[PDB]
């Protein structure tokens, strides 16, 4: 039987290592006007702006290329014992996956 330790060791997310400046594949699952919510396999989705080039091609279920900057955007502020989280990842939308 495969233990949880083996699963974590051989998980693609674990294998990726640091998430900064890593190219990943995400899928559009929600659209709000020009805001595209993309899941790329992480804990949180990322919200991207619809590109001005071939914007019509970006629809729900579309596969897109992303450059990950942070898996979760957090920041400790003055006079706070715990970090404040926006519950979103940071990524840059590169284009559609051919």
């Amino acid at each position: 039987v495969e233990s949880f330790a083996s699963m974590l060791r051989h998980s693609p997310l674990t294998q990726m290592g640091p998430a900064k400046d890593k190219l990943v594949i995400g899928r559009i699952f929600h659209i709000v006007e020009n805001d595209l919510y993309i899941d790329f396999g992480g804990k949180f989705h990322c919200v991207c702006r619809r590109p001005e080039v071939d914007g019509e091609k970006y629809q729900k279920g579309t596969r897109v290329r992303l450059r990950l900057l942070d898996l979760e955007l957090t920041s400790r502020f003055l006079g706070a014992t715990t970090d404040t989280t926006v519950l979103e990842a940071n990524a840059v939308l590169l284009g559609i996956q051919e």
Partner: protein, 133 residues
């Protein structure tokens, strides 16, 4: 009705004491189920504490041997132009294949970190995977 002192004991202890004391005529519907199958921890209120001095959280950082190799790879050949597909449970990145080849060479040869890296690069190029330093 039961006591509303949520900070004293637990719901089970309060209900049990009130039932035995006669305040509650009948046990609630969940009392028997709780008694038969209790939780791992009794749900008792506790105030979280800020740590000071040398007190530290016991949470360890998750590291593996291959991570070293990965770091060097990500420092030498950079991030692979190929994109990661985290949805696939068995995705294999260029770095992962480099790691597997490195480990196979280590188990089938000597232990010289630079030589393993260079020969692993030669082997991957022989297989036909582009690797731009």
């Amino acid at each position: 009705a039961g006591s509303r002192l949520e900070t004293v004991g637990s719901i089970f202890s309060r209900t049990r004491d009130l039932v035995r004391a006669g305040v509650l005529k009948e046990k609630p519907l969940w009392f028997d189920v709780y008694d038969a199958f209790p939780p791992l921890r009794e749900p008792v209120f506790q105030r979280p504490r800020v740590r000071y001095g040398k007190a530290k959280a016991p949470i360890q950082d998750i590291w593996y041997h291959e991570d070293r190799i990965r770091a060097k790879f990500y420092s030498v050949y950079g991030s692979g132009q190929r994109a990661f597909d985290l949805f696939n449970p068995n995705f294999k990145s260029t770095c992962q294949r480099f790691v597997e080849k490195y480990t196979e060479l280590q188990k089938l040869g000597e232990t010289d970190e630079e030589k393993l890296f260079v020969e692993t690069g030669k082997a991957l190029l022989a297989e036909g995977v582009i690797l731009r330093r």
